[PDB]
Amino acid sequence: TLPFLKCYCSHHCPEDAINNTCITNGHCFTMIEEDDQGETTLTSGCLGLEGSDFQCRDTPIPHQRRSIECCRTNLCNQYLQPTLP
């Protein structure tokens, strides 16, 4: 299946991204991540279709907490804004 979907990407861009944009056959993502001492930072990019279900499902307990959201419409991820539970 061919790439058909455009997503914003911000820390996970492919080297050849265009205007901070990636293309994919999977889903756009946007992620919120806390570190070990305070600073929380935001990420987004494209998820390949294969294994998209394990990456767009919501975990219970990593080392420091984070959340991730996916959608399937062009540039749909600046409209996502995930928060920590």
């Binding site: 990407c9 996970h12 861009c13 492919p14 080297e15 990636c22 994919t24 056959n25 999977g26 993502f29 992620m31 990019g45 494209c46 998820l47 390949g48 294969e50 294994g51 394990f54 990456q55 975990t59 307990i61 990593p62 080392h63 991730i68």
Partner: protein, 103 residues
């Protein structure tokens, strides 16, 4: 700094092979290196396994992350010397990194 392809030229003279490899004098081999973080973006061609393993890592540190490796590779030709010393033309597969991903 995430998994990607980096330059690497292998000069046969530098590694002392210049005396059984008659040509080319060297080649662009490239290599792969860098983090395989979560989530694994599309441009890392990850396998389902590399992905499962990546999640398992975030929850059990004793389980290593996916590694960054060649993920597509191309051949090159060389002129070399037979076990018995003399010009021979062989196609060497998987000599050149075309792309990298997390596996």
């Amino acid at each position: 700094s995430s998994c990607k392809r980096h330059p690497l030229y292998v000069d046969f003279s530098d590694v002392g092979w210049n005396d059984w490899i008659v040509a080319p004098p060297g080649y662009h081999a490239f290599y792969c290196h860098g983090e395989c973080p979560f989530p694994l973006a599309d441009h890392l061609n990850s396998t389902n396994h590399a992905i499962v393993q990546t999640l398992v890592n975030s929850v059990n540190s004793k389980i290593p992350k996916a590694c960054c490796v060649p993920t597509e590779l191309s051949a090159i030709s060389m002129l070399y010397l037979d076990e018995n010393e003399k010009v021979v033309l062989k196609n060497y597969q998987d000599m050149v990194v075309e792309g990298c991903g997390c596996r």
